[PDB]
Paper text:
Monomer1 has 84 Chls a, 19 β-carotenes, 3 [4Fe-4S] clusters, two phylloquinones, and three lipid molecules, whereas monomer2 possesses 81 Chls a, 19 β-carotenes, 3 [4Fe-4S] clusters, 2 phylloquinones, and 3 lipid molecules. The locations of these molecules are similar to those in the prokaryotic and eukaryotic PSI structures, although the number of Chls differs significantly. There are two copies of the psaA and psaB genes in Cyanophora, namely, psaA1/psaA2 and psaB1/psaB2; however, all of the PsaA and PsaB subunits in the tetramer structure is identified as the gene products of psaA1 and psaB1. Examination of the subunits in the tetramer exhibits that PsaK is present in monomer1 and monomer1′ but absent in both monomer2 and monomer2′. In particular, PsaK from one monomer is tightly associated with PsaL from the adjacent monomer at the center of the tetramer. Gln88 and Ser89 of monomer1-PsaK interact with Val64, Glu65, Arg70, and Asn71 of monomer2-PsaL at distances of 2.8–3.2 Å at the center of the tetramer. Monomer1-PsaK is also associated with monomer2-PsaL through hydrophobic interactions between Ala109/Pro113 of monomer1-PsaK and Ala27/Val28 of monomer2-PsaL at the stromal side of the center. Residues in this region are required for the interaction of PsaK with PsaL and PsaK from other monomers in the Cyanophora PSI tetramer.
Photosystem I (PSI) is one of the two photosystems functioning in light-energy harvesting, transfer, and electron transfer in photosynthesis. We present a 3.8-Å resolution cryo-electron microscopic structure of tetrameric PSI isolated from the glaucophyte alga Cyanophora paradoxa, which reveals differences with PSI from other organisms in subunit composition and organization. The structure of a PSI-monomer unit within the tetramer is similar to that in the cyanobacterial and plant PSI cores, except that the cyanobacterial PSI contains an additional subunit PsaX that is lacking in the Cyanophora PSI, whereas the higher plant PSI has additional PsaG and PsaH subunits but without PsaM.
Residue numbers in the entry:
A (entry chain D): 78 to 216
B (entry chain I): 4 to 33
C (entry chain E): 1 to 62
D (entry chain J): 3 to 39
E (entry chain F): 26 to 186
F (entry chain C): 2 to 81
G (entry chain L): 15 to 145
H (entry chain A): 14 to 752
The structure:
């Protein structure tokens, strides 16, 4: 789970983050264990310091979580980032890793959502699907 | 005399009315 | 049946190299759909030179 | 250096330097050629 | 006399352009020292003007009411030197540069590295295509008849339909 | 949300998944071969529509397509 | 922490002026805080109209300037009515339940702005043409 | 400590064959035609392909030698064409009457009509570069001294070009030779700037002051002794300012008051020429030298004494600003771009200061009466300055993407500006909108008032007045400052604030530029247009790494066009695209500054003086009531003063008329690239590759459309070139005819 409360990094700043959208619906939180006391750029402004931790950071967008979750895998090789999205004034817990593994890795039990059993040149003309509820790419 | 009454009616007053019903029709919800 | 090194013409109408000549680099010896790998002299807009086609999209102009 | 002069910007320039100077010297001895006489 | 255009030898507006061009240079000459170097450059400019009015009078050009030589392209052979004769003189030169760069690219494309030889130009193959480019009105005739000047549409790449 | 459809000319290259900035995509085993993979989009509500998954697909005229549909707050990429 | 902590952030010298203005003041009802807001803004709004007007050296300029400023307040009554018609639809409750968050008093606030706005426009007409 | 490497790079032509040799991305061959533009884009960006800061900095050092070569080559051409193809000898005899000229035009197709009646017995182009007035202040009287200086620059150009070969191929210094900023600041201050102003102070005393003392006595440029005779013959230097007879004994015994005749503080304009007194500028650079030589002994070196710039920043920290300047020295001795942007900011900010200080205090003799040059000298250095300030916001943004390190910057003054950037940008956002309403709308108000027949309701001097009292006061404290607070000065710092009309020839050299209601409006137009230009560039710097929109904008790069059509559409989000947008606004800002200048002087300042003393200006004092409306800017400035750039066909000014229309073309041609987008042309070219593939001759280098980033770049390049060269042609054809 989210394990809130967990210690925010030693930061103190950033006008650019977590405004009034967060309190009404859907903010996010990325949780990781940083194996140093080192500085890292935030998507808001740049520094904080990562704790020994159990480190947690409440971010506004999921796009800002995967951007920070890419920096911890690139620069510090801590790939244990585990993002969430909150409860009653939020929507959906445990966004990533969604099936216990990274999405670039294969995992059996996943189902091919959004797959098509055809090419793109085999897409029909929109005149054939005119005045119907079908769309020219759905199957 | 009728120009002096009609042109501030549809120059000022009548746009301010139709702006009001539109702005309520936009930001209402079912 | 196309073999490796054969100079083919592409009939895939969506492809960048439609109705153009390319040489098959290899074919996959399994039942995988689109096994025919053709290498082209001309790069597409993503600057690549290969693609996987089927045998229905290629011919044997040799 | 000869393989440098075969490159496109230099050989695009010296031939354009040649073809301009062709046209420049023509208008000095044959000025104001409107029509074929 | 094809559109009310009087010839320039009897056109008085054209003969009056000369009277004002030299009067605008003689007054430019009237202040300078007579033996000076800007003095002789104005007489070289005055006589270069007289070599274009006498060149246009004797050539049989057509001057309007303004007095400027008009050109007549419907092509008549009495006015053939305006557009028809330098146009034919153009078309060989442009087709020379055209067929040279086309013959260069067909020779280069059937090599090991074709894109390399477009950057650095092979002076053997460049001067070869000049030799194949001078004969282009003859060379394109047997090229079009042989069937290898154009390509059929199953060989070119074409957008989807 | 924007619609993301993955076509069968994919090769299991895994490049569009790791180029996704909002973690929409994932890799899944294939039915008819049970060895190769294909991309899949189970989280299309997160899709901003940046089309970075199309810039990474190596196939000629890419196997994954993004059709920009209705714009929610996630797909508009709004921090407010 | 998400908010930046400058030395003048959360200063009591300006957090006491915010807590005592008639938009955040605790004791007021929406009829009263619309009157206090309306009395302040209508008082200065007739300022620029009488000294910077299309007619300023007339009989004539103090009345028509103040006639213009009550023209703004009757426009801005509609804007406060339209903002309440839109943002409080069904009197949409929220997490704070103030006049600004949920509606809950809003029809009185616009009339309070109407009374104090048209008052101080006319009140400052007295101190300029007379007094 | 000098440390170098011996022969790291050979002097071969193996890499002259292959274009693109430097990068792993290039030199494989152009598969498409973007490679031709990818090559010319990332050549002199050494930081991308070379990943060693030692190897990068050697390329940068020896490349400035090549740029030092081309300036010296350009300077020799300035001196050669003054020697051979100029009327400089005849001009010194009559400097007011004869127009300065170089660049004779060849007798070919008709461009020998540009060789006009320029003065005396010479025919050429009336030039507006001020080299005739610069060489007269240097003391030059014959063309042989120009001819040897043209040779002297070419040998110096070869000397710099050899030094760039030597210091990269043969003896390339290490990284530690470049990171020594304190010894570099010591050397450039006292040596480059101090001795450069000390040695030039030697020229103005021994050479410039003696010949100008006889030239302003007006004998002849032939009767005047050659300037080596003022060094040899000490009786000749004694008949003019007789204080040279005492030698250097007033200098070493500190009895400097004996130099009161060639080291003055006269401080005005010469009544014979209309330039600054040369004995002022002789005393000037001598005082500048000692301030620069003394300041060059400040920073620490290997001798213990001296300031350390790393320990000045440590313990310059307050309670507002966290860790202070700790880290900005380590940033500045590693980032070549943060060094470039700051040195570009104050090079371009200086270049506008040079323009403002040279029309009001004309340094050269007969520069003030030469209205044809003083306007072009202003408008040049303003335009040069604004390009460099955009390069400051450019290279500050390139610093943020790859040279910014978050580990080195925690709670310092780079971190704390990148943490409240939403407060900086939005408060900058408001102050443009406040200034755009309250400066441009006061013109829109004045248009509407004069259109409606209401001239008593606009902002004017016979209307609602907006007098500039904060600037009119500063005109008062600087016009009444000679004798009270600068007591040794005989006259004021300039005649622009207040003073007499200095009339050299029949024309005004300088007169007090008054300030009124119109001057309040334009100076707030300038305040507005600058603040938007700051706003675009500073938004590019502070958001170069990330935003709320794209949190990994530094992972994508400094120069990338978009992140796609998602997030609503993310076109022009990068740091490069803010530099691209700021270029127009810099063009928008500076072109009003040059329109303000060109009509302020023509109406109120520049003009003729009659034999009694009354002044009749050029445009006749129509800036006061015309330049408060946009129609008066259109009718009385752009329409009324372009009557010389269009009536110039058939005269000697005809190439200004052809450059006028020819720059309207390139400006309007640029909108083809700016307004449109790439993917139209990539499918238009697909119809043209077909019509070449039909006849079997399509090139193997595949044709592509220009990229999105290039199409923006090729559109802003022709936009500025189209509008500056229109302003070039309009300014030149106007002031040559009337001034
Ligand atoms: C298109 C319709 C329209 C019409 C008919 C007018 C008419 C007027 N405008 Mg204009 N104005 C308009 C649109 C219009 N405006 C737009 C679109 C702009 C933006 C460009 C402006 C910008 C503008 C400015 C800046 C000013 C005007 C002013 C005026 C007045 C000039 C004559 C005058 O002073 O009488 C003398 C009469 C008076 C001074 C008082 C008139 C009565 C007031 C406005 C209403 C009284 C309140 C009433 C109880 C209820 C409100 C009714 C009201 C909404 C109609 C006149 C009433 C001047 C003005 O006085 O503004 C008020 C002025 O300074 N206008
Ligand atoms: C680009 C090709 C080109 C061609 C075909 C010519 C051709 C010619 N030049 Mg020219 N010349 C050129 C470029 C060219 N020039 C350039 C670029 C310059 C500037 C350096 C000159 C400077 C020049 C001078 C000074 C003279 C010639 C002269 C001549 C003519 C005599 C033959 C000769 O070579 O000497 C011949 C028509 C001569 C001539 O006959 O003039 C009457 C002559 O005196 N040329
Ligand atoms: C594209 C339209 C166009 C056309 C049809 C022409 C045609 C002509 N111009 Mg014009 N001109 C043009 C554009 C054009 N020009 C442009 C864009 C400019 C500004 C740069 C000028 C400025 C200009 C001037 C100042 C003069 C001309 C002259 C001429 C005449 C050429 C005289 C000559 O000796 O050439 C004959 C050339 C040959 C016999 C050699 C042909 C082989 C060459 C070397 C091939 C080069 C290919 C590269 C010819 C009628 C001259 C004239 O005669 O006025 C009446 C003249 O003095 N032109
Ligand atoms: C003259 C003998 C000579 C030779 C044979 C070389 C050879 C080499 N140099 Mg060296 N070098 C030299 C002199 C020489 N250099 C000089 C005089 C300088 C000082 C400028 C340098 C400074 C230098 C640097 C910093 C670098 C090299 C590099 C190189 C290597 C590759 C360069 C290349 O292939 O592009 C050839 C380049 C050109 C032909 C373009 C030259 C552009 C000139 C200098 C200016 C042109 C601008 C001009 C004013 C045009 C204005 C616009 C116009 C329309 C008016 C190659 C071994 C590179 C290297 O070793 O990489 C590992 C490298 O980074 N050189
Ligand atoms: C700063 C760069 C520069 C520029 C833009 C010019 C420009 C010019 N020079 Mg100058 N010149 C320069 C530096 C420059 N010069 C230097 C450094 C020298 C000493 C080496 C000269 C020595 C010189 C002479 C002796 C002459 C010129 C001439 C010219 C004019 C004709 C162009 C030409 O003949 O090219 C020819 C084309 C090529 C050389 C291409 C190969 C043109 C205005 C000519 C002139 O003005 O005639 C009245 C002329 O006679 N120049
Ligand atoms: C007092 C001796 C002295 C003098 C007169 C100069 C003068 C100069 N140096 Mg400096 N330089 C010096 C010592 C000196 N340097 C020392 C001791 C160092 C190393 C600590 C440097 C490191 C240095 C670099 C890296 C550069 C200069 C550059 C320059 C030139 C500036 C451009 C200009 O305005 O013209 C100028 C010639 C610039 C230049 O033009 O390089 C070619 C440049 O890029 N210098
Ligand atoms: C910095 C450059 C510079 C140089 C190279 C010179 C060089 C010279 N000065 Mg000058 N001078 C200079 C700046 C310079 N001066 C400055 C800044 C002042 C004002 C303080 C003077 C004031 C001055 C006087 C009054 C005299 C010289 C004289 C001399 C000459 C003999 C002095 C000597 O070398 O022992 C020598 C040519 C003497 C001379 O020969 O004048 C003709 C002489 O009488 N100088
Ligand atoms: C002349 C054309 C033009 C105009 C009017 C504008 C206007 C503006 N630009 Mg734009 N811009 C332009 C060309 C123009 N730009 C071009 C060609 C480019 C491409 C390079 C840009 C790229 C660009 C950038 C990158 C930025 C701007 C910004 C701005 C805004 C500056 C804020 C301000 O002071 O507003 C003041 C408003 C005016 C001066 C308009 C005058 C109108 C009068 C005063 C009022 C209107 C009368 C009346 C009340 C109308 C209402 C009545 C009606 C509804 C009935 C302003 C809206 C900046 C911004 O938005 O930051 C805040 C910014 O960063 N622009
Ligand atoms: C303005 C005067 C000013 O700069 O005060 C100075 C003050 C910094 O004071 P300190 O002594 O904390 O500064 C130490 C370093 O800034 C320089 O030594 O600036 C700030 O607090 C930021 C200003 C924000 C700018 C607000 C507008
Ligand atoms: C016109 C245009 C193009 C097409 C322009 C192209 C493809 C540039 C090609 C023109 C040059 C002039 C081709 C040069 C070809 C050779 C170098 C010519 C050599 C001749 C020698 C004699 C020198 C774009 O690609 C584009 C992209 C994005 C936004 C706007 C635009 C845009 O406006
Ligand atoms: S991006 Fe496309 S081609 Fe690449 S692995 Fe995914 S589905 Fe296959
Ligand atoms: S459009 Fe962007 S966010 Fe959506 S699936 Fe593709 S890469 Fe991921």
């Amino acid at each position: 789970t989210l394990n809130l409360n967990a210690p925010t990094p030693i930061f103190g700043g950033s006008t650019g983050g977590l405004l009034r959208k967060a309190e009404v619906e859907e903010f996010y939180s990325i949780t990781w264990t940083g194996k140093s006391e080192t500085v890292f750029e935030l998507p808001t402004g740049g520094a904080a310091i990562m704790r020994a931790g159990e480190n947690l950071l409440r971010l506004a967008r999921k796009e800002q979580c995967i951007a920070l979750g890419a920096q911890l895998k690139d620069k510090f090789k801590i790939t244990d980032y585990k993002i969430y999205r909150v409860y009653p004034s939020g929507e959906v817990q445990f966004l990533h890793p969604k099936d216990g593994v990274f999405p670039e890795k294969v995992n059996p039990g996943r189902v091919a959502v959004g797959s098509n059993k055809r090419r793109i040149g085999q897409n029909p003309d929109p005149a054939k699907l005119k005045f119907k509820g079908q769309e020219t790419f759905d199957s | 005399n009728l120009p002096s009454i009609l042109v501030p009616m549809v120059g000022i007053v009548l746009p301010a009315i139709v702006m009001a019903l539109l702005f309520v029709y936009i930001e209402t919800d079912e | 049946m196309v073999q490796r090194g054969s100079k083919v013409r592409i009939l895939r109408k969506e492809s960048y190299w439609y109705q153009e000549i390319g040489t098959v680099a290899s074919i996959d010896q399994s039942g995988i759909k689109y096994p025919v790998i053709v290498r082209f002299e001309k790069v597409n807009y993503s600057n690549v030179n290969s693609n996987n086609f089927s045998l229905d999209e290629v011919v044997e102009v040799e | 250096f000869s393989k440098y002069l075969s490159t496109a910007p230099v050989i695009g320039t010296l031939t354009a330097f040649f073809l301009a100077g062709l046209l420049i010297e023509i208008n000095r001895f044959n000025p104001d050629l409107l029509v074929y006489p | 006399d094809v559109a009310g255009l009087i010839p320039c030898s009897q056109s008085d507006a054209f003969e009056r352009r000369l009277k004002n061009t030299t009067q605008r240079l003689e007054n430019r000459l009237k202040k300078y020292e007579p033996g000076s170097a800007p003095a002789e450059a104005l007489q070289k400019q005055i006589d270069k003007t007289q070599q274009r009015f006498d060149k246009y009078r004797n050539s049989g050009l057509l001057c309007g009411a303004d007095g400027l030589p008009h050109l007549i392209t419907d092509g008549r052979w009495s006015h053939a030197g305006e557009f028809t004769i330098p146009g034919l003189l153009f078309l060989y030169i442009a087709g020379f540069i055209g067929w040279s760069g086309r013959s260069y690219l067909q020779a280069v494309a059937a090599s090991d590295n074709s894109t390399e030889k477009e950057i650095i130009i092979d002076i053997p193959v460049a001067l070869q295509s000049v030799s194949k480019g001078f004969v282009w009105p003859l060379a394109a005739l047997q090229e079009f008849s042989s069937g290898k000047l154009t390509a059929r549409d199953e060989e070119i790449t074409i957008s989807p339909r | 949300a924007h619609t993301v459809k993955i076509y069968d000319t994919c090769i299991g290259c895994t490049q569009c998944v790791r180029a996704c900035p909002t973690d929409v995509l994932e890799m899944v085993p294939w039915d008819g071969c049970r060895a190769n993979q294909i991309a899949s989009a189970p989280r299309t509500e997160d899709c901003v529509g940046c089309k970075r998954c199309e810039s990474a697909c190596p196939t000629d005229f890419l196997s994954i397509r993004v059709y920009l549909g209705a714009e929610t707050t996630r797909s508009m990429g709004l921090g407010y | 922490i998400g908010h930046l902590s400058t030395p003048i952030s959360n200063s009591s010298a300006v957090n006491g002026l915010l807590a005592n203005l008639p938009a955040y003041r605790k004791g007021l009802t929406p009829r009263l805080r619309g009157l206090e807001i309306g009395m302040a803004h209508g008082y200065f709004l007739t300022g620029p109209f009488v000294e910077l007007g299309p007619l300023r050296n007339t009989d004539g300029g103090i009345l028509y300037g103040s006639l213009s400023a009550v023209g703004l307040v009757v426009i801005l009554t509609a804007c406060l009515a339209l903002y309440g018609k839109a943002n409080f639809s069904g009197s949409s409750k929220s997490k704070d339940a103030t006049l600004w968050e949920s509606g809950e008093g809003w029809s009185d606030f616009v009339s309070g702005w109407l009374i104090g706005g048209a008052g101080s426009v006319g009140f400052a007409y007295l101190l300029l043409q007379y007094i | 400590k000098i440390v170098i490497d011996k022969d790291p790079v050979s002097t071969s032509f193996d890499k002259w064959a292959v274009p693109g040799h430097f990068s792993r991305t290039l030199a494989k061959g152009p598969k498409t035609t973007t490679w031709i533009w990818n090559l010319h884009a990332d050549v002199h960006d050494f930081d991308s392909y070379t990943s060693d800061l030692e190897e990068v900095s050697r390329k940068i050092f020896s490349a400035h030698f090549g740029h030092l070569a081309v300036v010296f080559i350009w300077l020799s051409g300035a001196y050669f064409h003054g020697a051979r193809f100029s009327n400089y000898e005849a001009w010194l005899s009559n400097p007011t009457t004869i127009k300065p000229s170089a660049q004779v035009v060849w007798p070919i197709v008709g461009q020998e009509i540009l060789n006009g009646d320029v003065g005396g017995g010479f025919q050429g182009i009336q030039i507006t570069s001020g080299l005739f007035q610069m060489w007269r202040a240097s003391g030059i009287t014959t063309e042989l001294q120009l001819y040897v200086t043209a040779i002297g620059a070419l040998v110096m150009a070869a000397l710099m070009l050899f030094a760039g070969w030597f210091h990269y191929h043969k003896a390339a210094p290490k990284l530690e030779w470049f990171q020594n900023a304190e010894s570099m600041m010591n050397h450039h201050l006292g040596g480059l700037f101090g001795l450069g102003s000390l040695s030039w102070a030697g020229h103005q005393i021994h050479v410039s002051l003696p010949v100008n003392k006889l030239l302003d006595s007006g004998v002849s440029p032939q009767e005047i002794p050659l300037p080596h005779e003022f060094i040899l013959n000490k009786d000749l230097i004694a008949q003019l300012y007789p204080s040279f007879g005492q030698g250097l004994t007033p200098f070493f015994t500190l009895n400097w008051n004996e130099y009161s005749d060639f080291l003055t503080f006269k401080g005005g304009l010469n009544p014979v020429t209309g330039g600054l007194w040369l004995s002022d500028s002789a005393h000037h650079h001598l005082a500048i030298a000692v301030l620069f030589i003394v300041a060059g002994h400040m920073y620490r070196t290997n001798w213990g004494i001296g300031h350390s710039m790393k320990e000045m920043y440590d313990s310059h920290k307050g309670p507002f600003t966290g860790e202070g300047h700790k880290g900005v020295y380590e940033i500045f001795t590693n980032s070549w771009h943060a060094q470039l942007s700051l040195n570009l900011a104050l090079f371009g900010s200086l270049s506008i200061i040079v323009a403002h200080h040279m029309y009001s205090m004309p340094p050269y003799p007969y520069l003030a009466t030469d209205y044809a040059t003083s306007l072009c000298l202003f408008t040049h250095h303003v335009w040069i300055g604004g390009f460099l300030i955009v390069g400051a916001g450019a290279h500050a943004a390139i610093f943020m993407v790859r040279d910014y390190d978050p580990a080195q910057n925690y709670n310092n003054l780079v971190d704390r500006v990148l943490r409240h950037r939403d407060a900086i940008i939005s408060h900058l956002n408001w102050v443009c909108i406040f200034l755009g309403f309250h400066s441009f709308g006061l013109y829109i108000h004045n248009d509407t008032m004069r259109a409606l027949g209401r001239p008593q309701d606009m902002f004017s001097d016979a209307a609602i007045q907006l007098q500039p009292v904060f600037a009119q006061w500063v005109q008062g404290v600087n016009s009444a400052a000679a004798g009270n607070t600068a007591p040794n000065a005989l006259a004021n710092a300039s005649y622009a604030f207040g003073g007499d009309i200095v009339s050299v020839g029949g024309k005004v050299a300088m007169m007090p530029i008054s300030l009124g209601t119109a001057d309040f409006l334009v100076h707030h137009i300038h305040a507005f247009t600058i603040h938007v230009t700051v706003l675009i560039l500073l938004k590019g710097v502070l958001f170069a790494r990330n935003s709320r929109l794209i949190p990994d904008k530094a992972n994508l790069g400094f120069r990338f066009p978009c992140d796609g059509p998602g997030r609503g559409g993310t076109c022009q989000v990068s740091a490069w695209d803010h530099v691209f947008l700021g270029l127009f606004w810099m063009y928008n800002s500076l072109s009003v500054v040059l329109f303000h200048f060109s009509w302020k002087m023509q109406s109120d300042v520049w003009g003729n003086v009659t034999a009694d003393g009354a002044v009749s200006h050029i445009t006749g004092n129509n800036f006061a009531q015309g330049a408060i409306t946009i129609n008066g800017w259109l009718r009385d400035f752009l329409w009324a003063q372009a009557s010389q750039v269009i009536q110039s066909y058939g005269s000697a000014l005809s190439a200004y008329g052809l450059m006028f229309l020819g720059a309207h073309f390139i400006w309007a041609f640029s909108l083809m690239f700016l307004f449109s987008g790439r993917g139209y042309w990539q499918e238009l070219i697909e119809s043209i590759v077909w019509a070449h593939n039909k006849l079997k001759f399509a090139p193997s280098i595949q044709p592509r459309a220009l990229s999105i980033t290039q199409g923006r770049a090729v559109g802003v390049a022709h936009y500025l070139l189209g509008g500056i060269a229109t302003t070039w042609s309009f300014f030149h054809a106007r002031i040559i005819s009337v001034g």
